[PDB]
Amino acid sequence: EDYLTVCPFERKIPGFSMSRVILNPEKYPLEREMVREKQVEMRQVLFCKENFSRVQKVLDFGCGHGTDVIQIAELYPHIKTHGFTITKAQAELGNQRIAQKNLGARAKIFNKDSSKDAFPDLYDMIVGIEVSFHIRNKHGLFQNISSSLNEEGTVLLIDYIANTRGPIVDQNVEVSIPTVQEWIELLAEHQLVIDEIIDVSPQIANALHDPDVEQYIKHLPKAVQDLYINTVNQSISLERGWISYCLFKLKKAPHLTYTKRCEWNASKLSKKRPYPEALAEMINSGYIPYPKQQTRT
Ligand SMILES: Nc1ncnc2c1ncn2[C@@H]1O[C@H](CSCC[C@H](N)C(=O)O)[C@@H](O)[C@H]1O
């Protein structure tokens, strides 16, 4: 019932330390509920143009603990959901939770590599939240995605864009972030175009404003210290402006020329929508199909 991503704060909260809350959740359960609400809110903005009544099949190509695989299937009993995660332990846990909720006939998670193992079905919606920057072989991945996307389908991503002339690559942590131009061409090469691109960089940086974090994590066990260092590094790069954290809504445009797909994508990326504007548009529409916020009693 948890999410392995950062989350957007509308403003900085003085004293709020994300590293304390994330790394010591038993000590900060209610603060962790605040975080969870923002994780839900961001996903609501990502999903809020989709018609789940039309969808029959969904894929999550880096599904974490399976939370979206599970929650979509629970909320929309007509849908079948598939997840891929390359981490065996995560796949084991997601399938155990699928079983415990008696969802096995409609939700299934596979311990597979989305850049190499062909997705097993054809999907109306393909979801990658904070997943492709962990994947070195981008063309393998987007070949896989495009080949498994129904003609009228949607791809929904939460991912990074590098605002530099060359891609941002950290070999030791297996992170690779394409530039603007590389994203334009990577998508266009696999028949995809940007329907909507939303920039959440300022809000994310607000949530990750943690002025003592570097000192704090040096007083934590090495193991604990090693897993959060990537979040620290991402926070720094967002603050510098080297990367942008964005929500992508993609469609297939197979009948458009490659050049026209490039020109479309470049135009969308030249005027990314601010998240507060997209969030306010969602609230004003009143249409919020997925996820739902948790409520007491
Ligand atoms: N090549 C690959 N194939 C499949 N999954 C991969 C992958 N590389 C990274 N991942 C997965 O991508 C996820 C990144 S963390 C994001 C998890 C989930 N989308 C969430 O929102 O909470 C992890 O589950 C990791 O195992």
From TrEMBL:
Q: Where in the cell is it found?
A: Cytoplasm
Domain of life of the organism in this record? Bacteria
- Write the protein's name: Putative polyketide synthase
Q: What does this protein do?
A: Involved in some intermediate steps for the synthesis of the antibiotic polyketide bacillaene which is involved in secondary metabolism.
Give the organism, scientific name: Brevibacillus brevis (strain 47 / JCM 6285 / NBRC 100599)
Q: Which residues cross the membrane?
A: none
Q: Which residues bind S-adenosyl-L-homocysteine?
A: L4, R43, G64, T85, T87, D113, S114
Please give the range of the full-length protein represented by this chain. 1164 to 1460 of 2430
**Coiled-coil boundaries:** none
